[PDB]
Nucleic acid binder design. Structure first.
Ligand SMILES: [Mg+2]
Length: 113
RNA sequence: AAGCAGCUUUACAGAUCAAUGGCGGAGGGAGGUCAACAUCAAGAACUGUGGGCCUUUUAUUGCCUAUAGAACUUAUAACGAACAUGGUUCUUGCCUUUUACCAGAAC
């Protein structure tokens, strides 16, 4: 096993470095999702219960989505629908219509966060 | 517009009473505080069908063109010359808290 592991060579990859730092959340940044269709923007959820949408090219703040009362723990954008799904420590699961920037559906039944 | 000739013919009477073609007949009408199914808000916005068309063979759809038929609804835009409630979010009001609520918006 060690022979056949040591003979092989890993592929080279270029190093990473820091490009930009964005501040504007009031709590810890807990989740990120990229625009899975056009790569134009990304969204972040936070301990400050908001969600913020960021222009990926300039890093500037597009809009703030305020629809949770506790930490937004995860965010997911659908590639087949114009929908953002978000979940929180406040036990709610919410769908946002990105053609209006409004909650349109709540999904109920989780006992805990 | 009536008197006469042409079209229509039908209550009839014929040649014909054969060979034809025309229009009907081979399961009736009016109703029901009966039912089921289909359909009713959209490029002013409809479906079928003949020929041509991008999907690599244009198929059934989307496009061009020819043509037959469109019931209901609608421009001081809606089936309803009528008019309720509820959910979510936002902003207000009353406000000791929730329900029940104040009244505007959006979906
Ligand atoms: Mg209490």
């Amino acid at each position: 096993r060690y022979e056949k592991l040591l003979s092989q060579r890993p592929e080279w990859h270029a190093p990473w470095k820091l490009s930009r730092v964005i501040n504007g959340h009031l709590g810890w940044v807990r989740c990120v999702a990229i625009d899975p269709v056009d790569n134009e923007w990304f969204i972040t959820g936070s301990n400050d219960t908001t969600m913020k949408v960021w222009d990926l090219a300039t890093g500037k703040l597009k809009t703030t989505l305020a629809g949770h009362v506790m930490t937004v723990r995860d965010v997911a954008v659908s590639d087949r629908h114009p929908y953002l799904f978000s979940v929180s420590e406040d036990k709610t699961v919410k769908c946002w219509d990105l053609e209006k920037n409004q909650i349109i559906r709540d999904y109920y039944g989780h006992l805990s966060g």
